[PDB]
């Protein structure tokens, strides 16, 4: 029914102010409460605050004096302004409406935007080094597992495909790990040994912030 959409930057520098927009389509912000919630790495959620139908605000005491929420009723948008952000303000930020009912209907519902992941760090754009992972040997069994190593990149995210999507069921791409300011990820793909190395298998690694186009068929060695 209703629609909320988070708009803003993905990466911010420490000490800088974090700025986000929540745009509301499907309903007016002239009625109800409109809030910002955030999900930390480790998955705890924190209620950040609200801006009312009348423009009144409420801010969680935990956000000390750093958070302010504004709105534009003749554009149906409300904004978050979070000052002096340290690395620990890194999270996915969601705008949302408290549980209510509406129209007619019997049931309580609520409305959440999709969320925006925000990275707080002073790193610079660094394409990843993409390496081939091929076994150093093998006689038997029916499957063979090969993969790719995407190391030292910034920022998130990275994307990995195998043979342009034509390999899927045996794929595992692992969450990225932050190490010494740089991200590292790996991906694996298991195929029948009568397909490799007989028939080529390639990892398609793309990194959006540094326009990287890496393809690397995994060859024996």
């Amino acid at each position: 029914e209703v629609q909320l959409q988070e708009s803003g930057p993905s990466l911010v520098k420490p000490s800088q102010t974090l700025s986000l927009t929540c745009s509301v389509t499907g309903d007016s912000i002239t009625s109800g409460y409109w809030n910002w919630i955030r999900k930390f790495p480790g998955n705890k959620l924190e209620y950040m605050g609200y801006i009312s139908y009348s423009g009144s605000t409420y801010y969680n005491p935990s956000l000390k004096s750093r958070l302010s929420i504004t709105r534009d009723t003749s554009r149906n948008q409300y904004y978050l302004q979070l000052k002096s952000v340290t690395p620990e303000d890194t999270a996915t930020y969601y705008c949302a409406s408290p549980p209510g009912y509406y129209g007619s209907g019997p049931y309580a519902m609520d409305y959440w935007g999709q969320g925006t992941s925000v990275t707080v760090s002073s790193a610079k754009t660094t394409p990843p080094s993409v390496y081939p992972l091929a076994p150093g040997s093998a006689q038997t069994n029916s499957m063979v597992t090969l993969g790719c190593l995407v190391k030292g990149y910034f920022p998130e995210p990275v994307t990995v495909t195998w043979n342009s999507g034509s390999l899927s069921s045996g794929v595992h791409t692992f969450p990225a790990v932050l190490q010494s300011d740089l991200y590292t990820l790996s991906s694996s793909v298991t195929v029948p040994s009568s397909t490799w190395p007989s028939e080529t298998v390639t990892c398609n690694v793309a990194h959006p912030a540094s326009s990287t186009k890496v393809d690397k068929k995994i060859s024996p060695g």
């Binding site: 595992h172 692992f174 790990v177």
Partner: protein, 214 residues
């Protein structure tokens, strides 16, 4: 400042099992709301005002409690119930949330398929050498990886990462990466990735020697 203590923190339930999640408050709250979050989706109201089913939630769920003790209950576990649940209170500002219950699917045990990979020739142009170990499609999730250099454990310089429960087969995967200085990688020839899990006690070891292959 109402503190919402939730339990258990993580758990696996078979299809059809009865499941109970508790949320205990620091102080009395008038009601407890419950939210559901599946991988890829935002949190969605699940239970409203302690016991009322929210739009789109099936009748196998229910809630109860009052004062400082509340619970949420699935009569019969379905695979689609797999997710993270959060209890929430709004009777006192600020509105607070519980730490969450990660609810997983229980399935048949499966030993990890283990595969080891040596550094690539491409990475040997730099000053680092990384060995990667893949421990995939296993169950349950608890697993330990040990990295042996010449049959001798090495701790740290390791980078471990887990996938979330596979959506098709309910298993888990885990990658381990040992990044060494290139010169230290060439002083040792035996590289072993050892997995200790639940199949048996000792198991799954994959190795490669630096002296072999090129």
């Amino acid at each position: 400042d109402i503190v919402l203590s939730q339990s258990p923190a993580i758990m696996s339930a078979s299809p059809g099992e009865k499941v109970t999640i508790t949320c205990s408050a620091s102080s009395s709250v008038s009601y407890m709301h419950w939210f559901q979050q599946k991988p890829g989706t935002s949190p969605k109201l699940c239970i409203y005002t302690t016991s009322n089913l929210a739009s789109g939630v099936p009748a196998r769920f229910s809630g109860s409690g009052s004062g400082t003790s509340y619970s949420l209950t699935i009569s019969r576990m379905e695979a689609e119930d797999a997710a993270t649940y959060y209890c929430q209170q709004r009777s006192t500002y600020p509105p607070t949330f519980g730490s969450g219950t990660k609810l997983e699917i229980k399935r048949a045990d499966a030993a990890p398929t283990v595969s080891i990979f040596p550094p690539s020739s491409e990475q040997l142009t730099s000053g680092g050498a990384s060995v990667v170990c893949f421990l995939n499609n296993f169950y349950p999730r608890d697993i330990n990886v040990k990295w042996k250099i010449d049959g001798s454990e090495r701790q740290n310089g390791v980078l471990n990462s887990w996938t979330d429960q596979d959506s098709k087969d309910s298993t888990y995967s885990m990658s381990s990466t040992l990044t060494l200085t290139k010169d230290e990688y060439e002083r040792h020839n035996s590289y072993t990735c050892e997995a200790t899990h639940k199949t048996s006690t000792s198991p799954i070891v994959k190795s490669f020697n630096r002296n072999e292959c090129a």
